[PDB]
Amino acid sequence: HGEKSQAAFMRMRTIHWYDLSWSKEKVKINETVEIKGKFHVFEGWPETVDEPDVAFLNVGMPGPVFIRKESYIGGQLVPRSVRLEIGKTYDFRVVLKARRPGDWHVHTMMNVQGGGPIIGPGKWITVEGSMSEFRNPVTTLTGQTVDLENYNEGNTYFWHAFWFAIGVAWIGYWSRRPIFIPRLLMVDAGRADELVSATDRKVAMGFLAATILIVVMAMSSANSKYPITIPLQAGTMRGMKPLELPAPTVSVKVEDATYRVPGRAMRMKLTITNHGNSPIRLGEFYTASVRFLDSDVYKDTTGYPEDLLAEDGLSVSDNSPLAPGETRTVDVTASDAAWEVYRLSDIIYDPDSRFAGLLFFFDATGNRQVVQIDAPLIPSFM
Amino acid sequence: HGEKSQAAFMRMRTIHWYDLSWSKEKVKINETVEIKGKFHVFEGWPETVDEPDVAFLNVGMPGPVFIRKESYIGGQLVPRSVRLEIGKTYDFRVVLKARRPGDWHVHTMMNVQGGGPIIGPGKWITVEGSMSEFRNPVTTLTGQTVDLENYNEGNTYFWHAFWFAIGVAWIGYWSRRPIFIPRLLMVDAGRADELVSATDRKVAMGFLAATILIVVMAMSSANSKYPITIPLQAGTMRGMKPLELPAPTVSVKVEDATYRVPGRAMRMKLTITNHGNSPIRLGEFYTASVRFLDSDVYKDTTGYPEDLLAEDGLSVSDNSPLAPGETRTVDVTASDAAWEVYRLSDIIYDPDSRFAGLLFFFDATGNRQVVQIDAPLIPSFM
Amino acid sequence: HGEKSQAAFMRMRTIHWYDLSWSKEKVKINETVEIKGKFHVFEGWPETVDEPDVAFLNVGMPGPVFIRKESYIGGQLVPRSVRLEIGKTYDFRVVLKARRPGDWHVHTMMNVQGGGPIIGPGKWITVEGSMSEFRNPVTTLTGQTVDLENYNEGNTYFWHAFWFAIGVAWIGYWSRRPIFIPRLLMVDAGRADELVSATDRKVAMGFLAATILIVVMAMSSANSKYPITIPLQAGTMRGMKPLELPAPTVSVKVEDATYRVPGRAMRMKLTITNHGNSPIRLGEFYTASVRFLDSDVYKDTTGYPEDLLAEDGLSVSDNSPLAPGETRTVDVTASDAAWEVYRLSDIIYDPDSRFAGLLFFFDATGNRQVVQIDAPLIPSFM
Ligand SMILES: CCCCCCC/C=C/CCCCCCCC(=O)OC[C@H](COP(=O)(O)OCCN)OC(=O)CCCCCCCCCCCCCCC
Ligand SMILES: CCCCCCC/C=C/CCCCCCCC(=O)OC[C@H](COP(=O)(O)OCCN)OC(=O)CCCCCCCCCCCCCCC
Ligand SMILES: CCCCCCC/C=C/CCCCCCCC(=O)OC[C@H](COP(=O)(O)OCCN)OC(=O)CCCCCCCCCCCCCCC
Ligand SMILES: CCCCCCC/C=C/CCCCCCCC(=O)OC[C@H](COP(=O)(O)OCCN)OC(=O)CCCCCCCCCCCCCCC
Ligand SMILES: CCCCCCC/C=C/CCCCCCCC(=O)OC[C@H](COP(=O)(O)OCCN)OC(=O)CCCCCCCCCCCCCCC
Ligand SMILES: CCCCCCC/C=C/CCCCCCCC(=O)OC[C@H](COP(=O)(O)OCCN)OC(=O)CCCCCCCCCCCCCCC
Ligand SMILES: CCCCCCC/C=C\CCCCCCCC(=O)OC[C@H](COP(=O)(O)OCCN)OC(=O)CCCCCCCCCCCCCCC
Ligand SMILES: CCCCCCC/C=C\CCCCCCCC(=O)OC[C@H](COP(=O)(O)OCCN)OC(=O)CCCCCCCCCCCCCCC
Ligand SMILES: CCCCCCC/C=C\CCCCCCCC(=O)OC[C@H](COP(=O)(O)OCCN)OC(=O)CCCCCCCCCCCCCCC
Ligand SMILES: [Cu+2]
Ligand SMILES: [Cu+2]
Ligand SMILES: [Cu+2]
Ligand SMILES: [Cu+2]
Ligand SMILES: [Cu+2]
Ligand SMILES: [Cu+2]
Numbered sequence A, B, C: 001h002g003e004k005s006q007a008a009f010m011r012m013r014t015i016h017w018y019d020l021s022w023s024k025e026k027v028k029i030n031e032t033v034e035i036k037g038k039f040h041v042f043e044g045w046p047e048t049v050d051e052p053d054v055a056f057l058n059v060g061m062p063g064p065v066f067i068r069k070e071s072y073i074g075g076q077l078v079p080r081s082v083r084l085e086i087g088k089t090y091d092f093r094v095v096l097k098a099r100r101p102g103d104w105h106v107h108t109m110m111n112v113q114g115g116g117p118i119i120g121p122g123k124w125i126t127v128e129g130s131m132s133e134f135r136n137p138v139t140t141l142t143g144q145t146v147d148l149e150n151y152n153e154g155n156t157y158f159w160h161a162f163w164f165a166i167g168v169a170w171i172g173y174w175s176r177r178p179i180f181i182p183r184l185l186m187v188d189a190g191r192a193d194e195l196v197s198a199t200d201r202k203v204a205m206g207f208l209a210a211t212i213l214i215v216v217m218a219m220s221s222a223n224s225k226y227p228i229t230i231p232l233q234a235g236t237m238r239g240m241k242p243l244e245l246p247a248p249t250v251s252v253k254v255e256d257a258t259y260r261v262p263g264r265a266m267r268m269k270l271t272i273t274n275h276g277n278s279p280i281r282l283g284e285f286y287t288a289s290v291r292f293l294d295s296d297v298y299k300d301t302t303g304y305p306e307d308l309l310a311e312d313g314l315s316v317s318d319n320s321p322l323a324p325g326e327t328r329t330v331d332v333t334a335s336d337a338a339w340e341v342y343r344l345s346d347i348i349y350d351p352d353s354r355f356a357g358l359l360f361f362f363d364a365t366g367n368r369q370v371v372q373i374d375a376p377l378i379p380s381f382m
Helices: A007-013 A153-175 A181-189 A198-223 A343-348 B008-013 B153-175 B183-188 B198-225 B344-349 C008-012 C153-176 C182-190 C199-226 C346-350
Strands: A013-019 A026-028 A033-043 A053-062 A066-073 A087-097 A102-112 A116-128 A137-138 A145-147 A252-259 A265-274 A280-286 A291-293 A315-316 A327-335 A354-363 A366-378 A378-380 B013-015 B026-028 B032-041 B055-060 B064-072 B088-098 B102-112 B115-130 B138-139 B145-147 B250-260 B267-272 B280-286 B292-293 B314-315 B326-336 B354-363 B366-375 B376-382 C015-018 C027-028 C032-041 C055-060 C067-074 C089-096 C101-112 C116-128 C137-139 C145-147 C250-260 C265-276 C280-286 C292-295 C312-317 C327-335 C354-362 C367-378 C378-380
Touching: A007 A343, A013 A116, A013 A354, A033 A102, A033 A116, A033 B314, A053 A066, A053 A087, A053 C145, A087 A102, A102 B366, A145 A153, A153 A198, A153 C067, A252 A354, A252 A366, A280 A327, A327 A366, B008 B344, B008 B354, B013 B115, B013 B354, B032 B115, B055 B064, B055 B088, B055 B115, B088 B102, B153 C367, B250 B354, B250 B366, B280 B314, B280 B326, C008 C346, C008 C354, C015 C116, C015 C354, C032 C101, C055 C067, C055 C089, C089 C101, C153 C199, C250 C354, C250 C367, C280 C312, C280 C327
Parallel strands: A026 A116, A252 A378, B026 B115, B250 B376, C027 C116, C250 C378
Antiparallel strands: A013 A033, A033 A087, A053 A102, A066 A087, A102 A116, A137 A145, A252 A265, A265 A327, A280 A291, A280 A354, A315 A327, A354 A366, B013 B032, B032 B088, B055 B102, B064 B088, B102 B115, B138 B145, B250 B267, B267 B326, B280 B292, B280 B354, B314 B326, B354 B366, C015 C032, C032 C089, C055 C101, C067 C089, C101 C116, C137 C145, C250 C265, C265 C327, C280 C292, C280 C354, C312 C327, C354 C367
8 A cells, every 4th residue: 555646657667576476365373474576676767766775675564464574685684774776686585474363465665765665566465363372482692582572561661660650759749738829929929948948858869869879770780680782783785686687589669658648558669679589479568566468478377466467458469479580560558447546647747757667578488588668658638 | 158267177087079060050040950979978087076977968059049959868869867977978969940140159068967067169150040030839749839939928928917917006006195104103103093994904805805716717717728737847867878889909008298388289108009900090189179180190071160170289209000019109299279279278277187088090991999098297397 | 003993893894905015024214115915895885884985095103103105006196085996906005104213003094985994904113213314305397306394394484473473563562551450441431532542543554554565575475486386186086997806716605604702713604616726725714904824725924913813713624625616514713812802802792793704715736716705793602
């Protein structure tokens, strides 16, 4: 939730999430779900979004209904912010543990500093069980195993209640006497010195000394109880390993790209050159989490969110085997209610009417090439 | 105009504009002139100029004597700011349309954010005709063809005059009575409440209600008249395609570079190694829009501004065919009044006495190699 | 001095200084000492240190006990700040001239803007002689040879004394009369106009006119005496040539890296793959200026500061010739008091417990390969 309201061109021109898998659709409490996939950083990064020099891989959900057990970018655990390069592709994996029952829309997201949220496709996952069964065991380097759900709760309650009680007692010591009107009149009359006695001064001195001594003793006792402590671990982790992918033996030029403004579709003229890899055929156009597929060339079998999957939303004028070398100019039409449901038609309000997306080409043997396209998008009103 | 006053080293060390062409020297009104060329970004970019992450290709002229019909960087239209990389070469093309008659010095420039203006060579172009014949037709996506010279002029005049008249009427309603002295005396005397009557309150209420209602009705009518509107299109366009140029089979090292301070020339010792490409010969040294040529090796036939063209300003101690492999140390002398006219001799006031420029080598067949040189420049006073 | 107090991980993860040489250990006054070596910029640059876009090569010493005659980065003189790229290796050379007698700990350092100091290994150098024998001759472009120790000293003294005397005379002219109490009483009594006479006004006018005229005449005389002047030369020098080094035919993966917190050592599990270059053997681990060596494989003969040299501080479970192709998992133990002396054990207070260093592999013929390792460092308390 939160993507439909984001500018259409910003969603089109930031990060592209390609083949994704979810290990389970329905999980029990304390069971783990794995979300893996690839994300590509668009070369034409918008200028109002800072470069992903400081980026964090996040899980979009209405709260800690899951707990993120681990997250890996390129096989490396990433508990901190990371640095990503423009134009590179990265594998990502996220292992989550179920905490609260219910149906949850879970998304993979990249939070970018100086940019904001970049939400990926969301999937509905059902958690069955009771929240009381959730456990979060962690073993420390000191040899102690604790449960993070209730660890250190009683100590915090005790100390906060103790200090609150001390403050309440300090206020109530003075609250046993007339408070506001008689004291104000006495101060106005010049009898302020009569409002504080020697016993009050002794009580204040005792309160101050007891507070300081208790703080010192509590710090000493806490140090004795936990002689091994480390500061909070923070920093930006550089040197993320990107994917070394086969360059596309397929070249695609966008002649024109238009959308009818009333409109639930997008149309584009494309010149495609096959540089080998056998006769190929376009099977899918990915724009903003929406996948328009050509049923005759490719069929999704990964449980891609159906609200974002158009099984026959790709209409190519001529989708015949493009013999290696053939340069065919084709008119592709990406049509689906998701265009209007995911407010991609709101590119009419955007201060930049340019789109970007991914095209997937398959040969007879099923090998897939990914081609990256970007162009300006012209609205049609006649 | 405006380059002679810019620091000499800043002009030497920012952008180099090489082979340029102008389609016409004399044009009529509504006729188009094309300026094409190449620009190279110097690797040793000055630190006080921000990197050209946000750069705009501009035309330097005393105003809209021309209208910039289009501009292309690397074959791509660039109506917005663009991103350029240090050390890369780009083709540029600018098509302008003549608007006002007269002789105009036209320059190609790169405005760089956090840096300032980078002016290129200027050429004198004559426009013949009358300004009243200039037309700027534009066809909108709604099917309307308009002339940008006078489009929406009457509407703006009408609305501004209407609101100015309303304000004048509001002031003049109160201006029919004594204004300053009697009213001031009455307010001082305590008779302020007598200065505003019930009729005045009713008039003020009517003015407020009429203003609000007129604004609302005008907005509704404007929306009805123009139901299709888009916001201003802005942004920085990345992914500019640079030139893939042959690396210079010629290696040049600058041993020493000196200039006499009184002085109208510059001298340099150079070690040149030919790595193939047949016997070569230096034909031209480009510094800051000034081209020093060796008449025996090369002759300009592009109509390069004569104030910046020194046909025999390159004197090479030995400019004989440098057999592939020969490593000759030569003393080159670049001499021309342009050195003093374009205030390149003002490098003596610069907080950085280092120069940069381009050397052009030609073989027997006429093939040209471009070598890029940079060195510190030492003034000579004895 | 000043490195032991710097965070251990910051010292481990910034710049690595490898093979270094000092021309002399004991020098006389006016004699020169050359310090050469290589420095590598770590790829995982810490986020709290700005990238070395503006870096200066500096000499760490308690003052001008030496004078830095020259400094070269990649064979190019670097009197100004320079730009360095992450992940590149550079040669550096520094020629210093002895000025003051005594024993001096001299370090090579890289000052990085927005980062702070990066100190390299320090060496003790003895200077014998008298400071009065030190000379700093410099020949100007005007044909004058001067000594920078005493040049322009007398002129500065004369002008400062002259202006101070003028100010003292101005104060003392008024100081001959009663100063504070009688004047205050007269001003309070309303007799302020009697405290300044016409002669005082004439004296003030003469002082003002003389000051302005003297300033103008002094400027004119200084211009006449030195008709050739240049502004201060400043700027950041880009285009530093890095080393083109053989990629390591040796691959090393860090399985685990741990340190006992009481502790004077560090332990690591490593998987090493030989990709040719004959049977190899680990001979040295460089962490933070500390070099742990395996005496049986390599011996230092460069006079590396002994406080930072552990001749037998590298213990490899199996350090037998790793036949090209062999993938051996070995347990290496780097032990030395320098770990505690140079406060590398203070990584326990660091907000980032990750280390980086260099491994040196030698074959039978003595050829050396440098492998770069980085990992998180886990403290052991049991
Ligand atoms: C829950 C209260 C709201 C917020 C409390 C915030 C800070 C505390 C303020 C007052 C503390 C001192 C009590 C008054 C002097 C406590 C005090 O003096 O009690 C005797 C009073 C005074 O004697 P008197 O002049 O002969 O009688 C006048 C009132 N009948 O008599 C009483 O019968 C008791 C009345 C006082 C009861 C108020 C207690 C509520 C405060 C404790 C709340 C603790 C929880 C805090 C978080 C919400
Ligand atoms: C690092 C330097 C210290 C900071 C400088 C200021 C220090 C001030 C000193 C007092 C100067 C005022 C004159 C008072 C003369 C001595 C003095 O302390 O008198 C009591 C004064 C009231 O002043 P007075 O009676 O008119 O003074 C005349 C002689 N008694 O109250 C206080 O000082 C505050 C309340 C009583 C203090 C008891 C200790 C509790 C507070 C400290 C914590 C102790 C427990 C430590 C935990 C381990
Ligand atoms: C061009 C004027 C300069 C700038 C104007 C700026 C804002 C407007 C100020 C005054 C408007 C109300 C007029 C006075 C009450 C208009 C008004 O009350 O007119 C009757 C006056 C007053 O009657 P009275 O007391 O019996 O006579 C005294 C003056 N003789 O009599 C007149 O004979 C007319 C004199 C007033 C003429 C001034 C008009 C100029 C202002 C309109 C300019 C519009 C263009 C604006 C942009 C420049
Ligand atoms: C979103 C919330 C609204 C903002 C809150 C403030 C609103 C204020 C309300 C009035 C409170 C003061 C008491 C007045 C009582 C009602 C009232 O409006 O009285 C007239 C008052 C003068 O006060 P009064 O006579 O002593 O009031 C006693 C009873 N009449 O003048 C005004 O309110 C201003 C001038 C007359 C207003 C006429 C409408 C023109 C202005 C609004 C635009 C209407 C056209 C819309 C275009 C589509
Ligand atoms: C070294 C002094 C410290 C700093 C000086 C800073 C600025 C100068 C202040 C005073 C200058 C005017 C002198 C007084 C009027 C100089 C002046 O009027 O001298 C005659 C006085 C006054 O005559 P009187 O009323 O009959 O006698 C009263 C004092 N006996 O008599 C004297 O016997 C001389 C006393 C004055 C000597 C003070 C001189 C010190 C100042 C010069 C220092 C220069 C070095 C500067 C850097 C440190
Ligand atoms: C660029 C524009 C200049 C700045 C504008 C202000 C200039 C002010 C002028 C004076 C106006 C006040 C009326 C005084 C009338 C003329 C005048 O100068 O009178 C003397 C006034 C005192 O005023 P007054 O006697 O009541 O004036 C009545 C007629 N004399 O003192 C001063 O002006 C200051 C002290 C005397 C000046 C002598 C010259 C020394 C200062 C200047 C440097 C000269 C040497 C140059 C070196 C090459
Ligand atoms: C959450 C836990 C709540 C803690 C509650 C603590 C109690 C707080 C205040 C008690 C007020 C009694 C005032 C009696 C003066 C009532 C009073 O003033 O009585 C006259 C005495 C006469 O004493 P004397 O013998 O003639 O002279 C002194 C030596 N003999 O004067 C005084 O000066 C008596 C001073 C006594 C002050 C006691 C207050 C100390 C409170 C510290 C509390 C510590 C916090 C808890 C620790 C875990
Ligand atoms: C650029 C175009 C210029 C537009 C010029 C607009 C004219 C402006 C002001 C007229 C002043 C007349 C004042 C008469 C009070 C003169 C006045 O006060 O007369 C006494 C009346 C008595 O009226 P009554 O009948 O006894 O009671 C009300 C119901 N019957 O009192 C009032 O309260 C009369 C109020 C009348 C106010 C009229 C002003 C409205 C002006 C709106 C202009 C709209 C803008 C143009 C639209 C395109
Ligand atoms: C470090 C070097 C130190 C320099 C010391 C300079 C001496 C400073 C002040 C002298 C005070 C004498 C005051 C006499 C008034 C004492 C005074 O006021 O005497 C009455 C005269 C009467 O003169 P008169 O003839 O009747 O009228 C004028 C034409 N004839 O009035 C005046 O107005 C006299 C004005 C004389 C003022 C002289 C002060 C000029 C000082 C400039 C110094 C230059 C700096 C050094 C250059 C290298
Ligand atoms: Cu959602
Ligand atoms: Cu992409
Ligand atoms: Cu010009
Ligand atoms: Cu260049
Ligand atoms: Cu030291
Ligand atoms: Cu390194």
